[PDB]
Structures are given as structure tokens and as C-alpha cells.
Amino acid sequence: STIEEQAKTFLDKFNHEAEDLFYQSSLASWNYNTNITEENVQNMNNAGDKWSAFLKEQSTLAQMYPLQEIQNLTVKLQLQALQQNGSSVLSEDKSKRLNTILNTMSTIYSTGKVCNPDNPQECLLLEPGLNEIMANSLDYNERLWAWESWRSEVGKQLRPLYEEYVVLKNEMARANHYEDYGDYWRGDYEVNGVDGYDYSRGQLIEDVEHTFEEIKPLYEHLHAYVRAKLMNAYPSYISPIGCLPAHLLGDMWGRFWTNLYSLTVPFGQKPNIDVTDAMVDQAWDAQRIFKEAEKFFVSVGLPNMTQGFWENSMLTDPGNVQKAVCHPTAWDLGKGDFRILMCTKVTMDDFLTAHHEMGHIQYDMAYAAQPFLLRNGANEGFHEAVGEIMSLSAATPKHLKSIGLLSPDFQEDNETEINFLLKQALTIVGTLPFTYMLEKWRWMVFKGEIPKDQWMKKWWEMKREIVGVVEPVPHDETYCDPASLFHVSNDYSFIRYYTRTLYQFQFQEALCQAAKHEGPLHKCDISNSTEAGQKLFNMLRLGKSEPWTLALENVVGAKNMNVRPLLNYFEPLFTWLKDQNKNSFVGWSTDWSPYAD
Template identity: 70%
Template sequence: MLVHFWLLCGLSAVVTPQDVTQEAQTFLAEFNARAEDISYENSLASWDYNTNITEETARKMSEAGTKWAAFYEEASRNASRFSLADIQDAATRLQIQSLQDRGSSVLVFLMGYLTSNLQLNSVMNSMSTIYSTGIVCKATEPFDCLVLEPGLDDIMANSIDYHERLWAWEGWRADIGRMMRPLYEEYVELKNEAARLNNYSDYGDYWRANYETDYPEEYKYSRDQLVQDVEKTFEQIKPLYQQLHAYVRHRLEQVYGSELINPTGCLPAHLLGDMWGRFWTNLYNLTVPYPDKPNIDVTSAMVQKNWDALKIFKTAEAFFVSIGLYNMTAGFWTNSMLTEPTDNRKVVCHPTAWDMGKNDYRIKMCTKVTMDDFLTAHHEMGHIEYDMAYSVQPFLLRDGANEGFHEAVGEIMSLSAATPQHLKSLDLLEPTFQEDEETEINFLLKQALTIVGTMPFTYMLEKWRWMVFNGEITKQEWTKRWWEMKREIVGVVEPVPHDETYCDPAALFHVANDYSFIRYYTRTIYQFQFQEALCKAANHTGPLHKCDITNSTAAGGNLRQLLELGKSKPWTQALESATGEKYMNATPLLHYFEPLFNWLQKNNSGRSIGWNTDWTPYSDNAIKVRISLKAALGDNAYVWDANELFLFKSSIAYAMRKYFAEEKKQNVDFQVTDIHVGEETQRVSFYFTVSMPGNVSDIVPRADVESAIRMSRGRISEAFRLDDNTLEFEGIVPTLATPYEPPVTIWLIVFGVVMSLIVIGVIVLIITARERANEAGANCEVNPYDEDGRSNKGFELSEETQTSF
């Protein structure tokens, strides 16, 4: 047992706040001692898996994770026995409050939830493995395959071949994203279940609680305030982003042509510098404003001067030491994985910093000799510096003031490391390099591609997840809403249609590995607030974007004070102590990029600012389908689901094969994977395109697809028990084929028999009435007006009288 029996019994007899505080401190002392060991075991098992992905290391990681969760759940339940109101010491109160949040471990020992916890671990391990080991193979050469890193990432970073990029982009999502879909659906359900057991409304609400502070009063901050501040700062940044978007669109149009880049539309998602369009850094060579100026991307200089991964990280360490922060430990250099292993191990290449515990710090990164990785090394080492600084805090307070703070610290260092002044000091720019207005714009554009370009991406992704977790977006429209929001908020469009079998968000590391993502938005706001304050401490004069705090121990001392606090103070208080402000403010960011914003406004004169969300790269060849099941089949209508969509794709593939064989005299093996469906609605409508087998870039012209549909339209409709009016291909005139007639039900037969008997009865009554009238004719009074040619209506039998049933 974590807490001795006497302690728990004694707790019930406590009557004074002082006694409660002392008991809580005793409880925490025992927790801290055991937590150090069990957490370290868990970290080691996770490290072993991430640096050597096998079934064995996955099993051991799961076992260690379950052991930690069980320990933490028991400690959390025991911590819940303390009343926070009765704890007088602020640090003790904060630790108990933190421990009372049980996280996903709440699923472990609550009755009936053990299976759910094991299931959640299995789902998360599976997603991580799929992501880390995923490959994309060429359709015509199934053994010619590429992993994400290194392989696909190189194509997405360097290729300017529209179709090669599309092959890599679509392949990653069609294979890895689709495999993730059923797992991510389970993940959402299980994470929501855990959040609700922790008294949160959903898992997004749980994530936002990381920013919540409730003590002391003047530094309170709510989850709702986070949402409001994110939306407010996004509106502040939007004009700058729209100008950047318009400029990038114009330059990409010059590269790819107006048939692939619409001058007023969204940007195709596969052209934006990496697999996800998250960072636009690699677009710099295509968009540099003044290409004749010396290149401030120093990748080529690093290669020429024989830099390697070790030199990159040693240089980053020297920067931190120069401002009075920490050297890396000896164990850091021994235990870290700074390059991809050459022994054929499968590893998670995504860069991460690890505070293992017990003074064991590591970085895992498949470093390449590029400027981008040079800056990433500063970012990851910034995490380690933060970890080292707050190691003096109790176990539960060894964390960033909030998740965004942790991310921001590394980014502050990247701001200084990227300046031409700093690069020149490292002999990566020529000694004769001179800064002028043009080199300044080149530098700021490069910074904006990385920093400003990613902010709508980050905001939109997390907004989508929040809406998924709270049920505002149902799983029947995950993909549809993902791309609608991507178009509306980011100005980015899918290059091919995607249906609800895809899970495009989970094709990103952070989504597949259960990371809150709003941290990457808040960190960008914080980093410029911090940078502005540190530059003042360093006595920097001039524009903010020219500030380099290298060698400023005054700036480093201020930063160190902030880092050492860890989570011991509310983040609002920590931010105020460092910057003078309690809350997020985008103004320093806008100051940093102000010269670029002014330049973009002039350069974009005459161009469309903003984007038309209707245009897509496949619009000209897409066909819209509307299906009316209820109108056609009434109460016998079936549910349209993934199986029906598969049948539709199969029917179109059949039609394409038949058309090519009979009309073009070609045997073309169309498959369901060559039929691309998107923009599905629950009323059953969608768009689709057809590509040639194995080549998503080779779109079959709409005219050929229409001809194929006409040739096989009857067979297609028959497969769904519909006709041309209830399975409508927009723009294709209905055929004259006999419409499908649904089987007659029993009640219709009975109704018909009854109606027939009634009709026969009426006819008999009419005939009988006429015979009686004829017999009485001799006695009938003659019309007195007959000879005058006038009629007496009282004597006429109207032939227009109808019997209504």
C-alpha cells in the first residue's frame, strides 16, 4: 500500500487545517519516494520501445505503463481524501490538487473499467506502431517502398514535382491514415470515458484544464478563457497570415501554373513543404523575395564545413551555457539517440526530449545536417534545460507552468539562433555578409514560413479535435468537416477527394501519439512575449527580429528564474513575473514581423487576399452523386454506410473496366482504390473522381467517366435497387431504361382486392337503377318546355356526375 493504514485512519480524525497540512506532506513524501522509481522504470521501457520497435519492447512498455497507472491511480484515490480547503501550505495544496487528477489511470481499478484501460493501452500502442513503421509502396513496384523518415519526408521537403509529391502525400494517408481510422474511433471513446470519470465534460475539456488556475484569486484562469484567448489572438494574426498566404500562392502559381494553383483559391495541401503542411519552411527556395542576395538558409554551408549531428547539438549546448544555463550531463551524450540507427532497428524518428527522472536526460532525433534540424536541436535542448531547471521541485511540480511554456522555451532559443548575426558568429555566413533591407525581408519571410504559416494549421487541428471530443462533429462526418475547416480557416484544400474511411488527422505524429496540440499555438504567442522581455534584459536596441541574446547572462538569469519555478506557481503569475503581463498577447509577434507585413502589403497589391473555398484541384473532373433511398424504397430503405460506399466504388470500377474494354479496346484493371470519394453528406451525396490504376495523379477525364456511367447505368442502379432519378449523377441525363420497381407488399394486394369489389358493386347499382327508370318511363311526366327548346334541370340526368371513392 502506498499510504500506511495508520495515516488513512488518522486522517479521518483530523480536525485542524494544520494537522491536515502535515498529514498531506507526510503522504506526499512517501509518494515522491516511490514515484521516482516507478516512473523511471516506465520511462526506460518507453525509451526502449521508441528506439527499438518490436513486439517484445511494446509488451514491456505496456506492462510498465500499467504498473505506473496502477500506482498513480491508488495514490490519486488516496489524495482525494484530503480537502484542499484545509491545506494551508500553497505548494502542498498544489501537489495534492495535481495528484487528485487521475488522468487515464482512472480506468484501471474502477469496477468494470479494467478492460477499458487495457483496451486504451492497446489502441495507443497500435497507433504509435502504425505511425512509426508505416511505409508507402509504388503500385507498379510493390517492393519499392519508403518509410516516412528518411524517405517520404525528403520528397515532401525537396521535390517540386506536383505528381511525385501527390503520390507520397496520398500514399501516407491512404495506407497509414486509413489503418488508424477504427483505432482513432476507439481512442476518442475511451479517452472521453476517462475524462468523464475525472469529472470533465470530454477529453478536450480535460486537455484545456492544463491552463486552468484557481488560486490565488488574482491569477485565476479558466478553460473557457483559453478558448477565448486563442480565438482573440488568432484574429490578431489573421491579416498577417492572409498576406503571407497570398504571396505564397502567387509564387507557387509561378512554379506549377494556373491550372494547378488557382489565383484566388486555397493552396493544395501536398505542396506546402512537409507531409502535413504544418511548416512551410521548405518553401523558402521557391518564395525567397530577393534570390540574388546571400542565402540565409545555411544548410549548404553546414554540409560544406562538415557539420554532423554531434556538432549541431554541441553548438546548441554552447548557446545555452553562454547565457548562464546548464551543460548537458555526461549521460545525455551516452544515452541519447541523435541519429537514426544503422543496425536496421525500427525507431520513432520524430524529435522528442526526455526527462527520464533521476537526473537522466535524453533526446531522440534522426538528425540531418540542415538548418531546420539545427534549429530543432535548439528547441529540443530547450526542453532539457527546462527539465534541469525545475529538477529542484517536488516530483509533481516538475513540469512547465503550462504545456505551452515548455514548448516556448526551446523556440526562444531558435529565434536567436536563426538571426544572421548569430549564424555569422558560427562561420555559417560569409564574414562579408551585410544586412540590408532586402536581406532583412528574406530573413523575415523565412521566419514567417515557419512561424506564421503554422498557426492556422495548429488552431484548426485542435479546434477540430475539441469538436470531435465534445460530439459537435460526429464520426460520420470527421473527414468532411476536417477538410471544410481546413479550407475555411487555413486556406488549404485536399488535392484528391477523401471519404470517411480516411483519418487524415491521425497521419500526424502528435495526433497518433496522444499529444494535446494547442500547446504549439500558445507557445508561439508566449515565445515572442518572452523574447521581448529577454531582449530588454539583454539591453538590445533596435527591431525585435534582430535580437540575439547569446552571451547575455542577464537575459539568461531572468529566464532561469522562470524555468526553476516549474509548476509551482500559476502560469499567469509566472508569465507576469517574466513579462509584466498575465495573459497571452500577440502584439510582440506582430512587432517582430511588422517590416515583412508592410512589404507583403505592397508586394501583394492587385492580388486577391483571402481564398475561395469552392475551388479544388479536382473540380473539373469531379461528378456529384445524389442518392434518395427513402424516396425510392420507402420503409424498405437501407442504411447508407461504408459497405454501400464500397459497393458504389466497385460499381464504378466495373463501369470503367467495361468502357475501356469495349470503347477504347484496352484492358485496364480499375480497382476501388482508384475511385476517390469526398465531401460526403449524411443525406447521401458526394463527389467522386477516377484515377488510372496505381497513379492518383492521372485523373480520368470527366467525359470518359460519364460515358462509362451511361454504358453501365442500368447495372449500377440495379445494384442499389434504385433508378436514374433516385441515384442521380449530376450533369448526366437520365436514360430511358425501365425504372426499378420494388416488390408489391401484401397490404397493397389486399387494398387492390377491396377496391375492385367496391367498383363492381357500384357498377351493379348503376345498371339496376337505369333498368328501374326505364320501366317507369311510361308514367313519367313530360318536360313541359321540350318543344320550346328549353330544358328543365329537374328532369335531366347529368352525365358529368362522378362517384368518388
């Protein structure tokens, strides 16, 4: 009997009851999401509360099996996933206060309004209107107003709440033996006792800081090019040797530079491939798109769709009145029930989103044999990378002209390839310094290296030094510019977006060598190759059974995340930028500011 055969017998009963209850809850959630009424909101909340109560009871029951006597690492993985207290290690007063400030911060972010200085009855929320001014406008003064007012009216409300949130979260995390909340967050990448695939929690910082040191020569040339291109839209507002003003970057925070494409297009007389008129002219509907996606996936040696996918999924917007959250998501209700909920038009971005979501569906179909608690990606960066390589491969001219959407000859030129690589760089490369700097600031704040009277000072020093953007207005310690972003005021980790971007290109380069590709990496199509499909399926089927450093090795051949595949992907753009900055000044100075004149 010992103590390891009783844990297995407990895990069996848990698996059976948990699978049942989770299916019930997921069916309720789907019924609500696809048909918004009032009684569905409660029919779903009852199932949600039942599931959470069951989970809490089983979690307090699983503590009675000490984790020291378990020798199987699968049983130990499941028990350790079930034994974690999380919250509820705090008092009742402290837990209630924490949930209260969380709801208050989310509500302030969601319903905050700012309005005009010359017409105080014209107040704009963020979602419909502020990040529509910040995305489309070419007025310096209007962008400055929208940037300053959002952080001065709504951001200043979040500071006394964030200061208490930090303390309560650190208190929660230290009662679970974690030293702070940031370490609690880094604990997703930890591996223990595999003898060759171990991974510390403090090793993530070192890995991130060593991989970022290699992206700097590419980001510097991209930054210099974008700066010299912005010195024409806003003359006498940018310095040719200084940073970039933070309110001119394309959105409210500067997370993606993708909206600067109309200003920084390399060859603006060469329109890039967009097969949307050919789809409409060939009479494509929402079902032909998903049939083509399923064909692409079955081409590499992956299964068809489950036949319950075609009957139960909602592939078009329900007409008459069936209010539904039209957001593409892949559902995994369990018990062999796979569905996709998205309201597709007939465009090209929907054609790519179909492949993106069917990638998630295939990943879920793969590991459906693992125990209930071991059904997820290897870590938080795997699922979206697996979904993103599919839309990477399905959008090349080689793939599009084999379907019939491009003319059968369609000679390509290098100018459109440079256009495409630059449009991709504004989204992929422009966000890595932002992500790194934000998560570094949050880590240092949770750790205690930044006292609470130097939060904004360090925020803007790091934004000048790492990212290379300068604020147009000084900010003292009454502001909170981090908390004005969704993921900061809503308690979400942010480092998944950094590791996913690296896993993505590692996977693509690993799968482009099994398909025996010859040209540049951005031209690769893994369709019609069953070796890439097998390499991918050897990792898709594991779930959380093995350490992520092992699942990574099964496709790539290395154990750690690498940045050389990304630079390999962007090499032609790198050479082009290196030749376009002959008389420019690559780099920036942390002294120039747009107000110090």
C-alpha cells in the same frame, strides 16, 4: 492532526520513494536508448512496470485525504496531481478495448503501405518514401497519387476505430467530471483559487479565437504571395482567386510550408548565412560546439554544466556497433544527474540544436529544488518556448561574427534579411491556421457539435474557410483525413504548438527590452546581458509551483498570451508582402475547386 498535517507526512514519504524509483527507471531507459541490445529492452521494461505499479498504488492511497480540507496550495497542487484517476475509472472490459483500439490505430499508422497502379509490387511506407515524394517532387500527378492513396488506403482503415475511440474516451472523461475528452485536454491550462490569476477551461477557446483573428492579415498576404509563386511551378492548375490545392503545399498534410522555399524565394541570387564551411575549416568538433553553447549560457548569468554532464553524456555517434536512437533529447534522470543524448555532426543546424537542448537542460537545472510532482514547465507550452528562444538568439549574424564563424566585416543587406524572414514565416506562420483548425475540429467533435455523419463535410468546409486549402478529390463519410496525421491517430493534444509559438515571441520581446536592443526584433542577441538572464531565471526556477499566468507575468508583464510580439517580429516581411501584392488578389474564395471544371 486535522487532515492537512497527515497529507504533508504522506507527501514526504511519497517524495522519497518516488525519487528513488524514478531514478532507477530513468537510468534503465537511458542504458537502453544509448546501447540497443535485447536484454536492455527487458531490464528497462521491468523498471518501467515497477514505477507504474508504485505510482498506481500511491494514487489510490492518496484519495483518502479529502481535497476540501487542504489549505496550502502547494500540498493541494501535489495531491490533486496525484489523485487524478485518469483511466482505470472504466470497467476492465472497456479499458482493455480502449488499449486494444489504441494499439491497432498506432500499428495501422506505422506499418501502412501504398503501392503503384502500374506495378503492384512496389509498396511504399509513409516514413521512407511517401513524405519523401511529397517533400521533393515537382510532378502534379505524382503528388496527387501520393496524397490520395495514403488517405484512401490507410485513412479509410482508421474510421471505424476512431469512431469507437471517441466514445470510449468521452466515457472515460465524463466519469472524471469533465463533460468530454476535449475539456479533459483543456484542463491543463486551468487555475483555481489564486484570486487574480485564475483561468477557466472554456477561456482557452476564447483566447485562441481572439488571438487568431489578428494573425489573419499576415497569413492572407503570405497565402497570396505563395499562391502567385505557385502559379509558375504549376501553371493552369491554380486559380488566382481561389484556395490552394492540398497536395502542393510541401508535405503530406500541409502542416509546414517550409519545403516551398525553393519555389518562393524572394531574391534567389543571394544565398543566406550558413556557417558550415568555416566550422569544418577551423577544425571544430562535437565538443567545441557544446563548449560554445555552455559559454553562451554562462554569459547571461546562468550556471555552468554540472561536471557529470561531460562524463556521462553521449555527444557523438558511438562508432563500432552501439545501435542508439540518434534523436537529440535532454535527460533529467534526477538526483542531480543531467545528460544530453545526441549524435552531432559538424554543421550549423547541429550548432543550433545544441543551444536548443542546453536550454532544456538549464530549465531542468533551475527547478531541481521543487517537490517531485512540481518539476515541469508551467504548462505544456513553456519548455519548448524556452528552448526555442535560445536557437533564435544564437543564429544571428551579430552572434556568429563575434564567435569567429563569419568574416569580421560581413556587411549585411536587406535582401538577405527578407530571405530569412520569409524562410522563417513558412514554418512559424504557415502552421498556425493548421493547428487552430485541427484542434477546433477535434474539440467540436468531442463535444458533439459535429455528428458522426458530417465529420468530413465539416473538416473540408473548415479547411476551405480557415486555412484556405481545397481538396483535389471529394471525400465522403468513409474517409478519415484527421486520423491520417500522427498526433490524431496516436492520441496527442495539438494546441501546445499554438501557444508555444506565442510564448516564444513574448519571451523574446521581453528579453530584448532588458538587453536594451535598438534595431528590429529579428536582430536581437541577448548574450552578455545579465538582466535578461535574471528575468528568465525568475521564471525558470518556479516549475509548477505557481499558476502559469503568474510565471508568464514574471518575464513579460502580462497575464495572458499575446500576438503583438509575433507581428512585431514579422513587420518588415509584412511591409514587403504588402507591397508585393499590389496587383494580386489578397484572400480566397471558398467556391473554386480543382475538379469542378
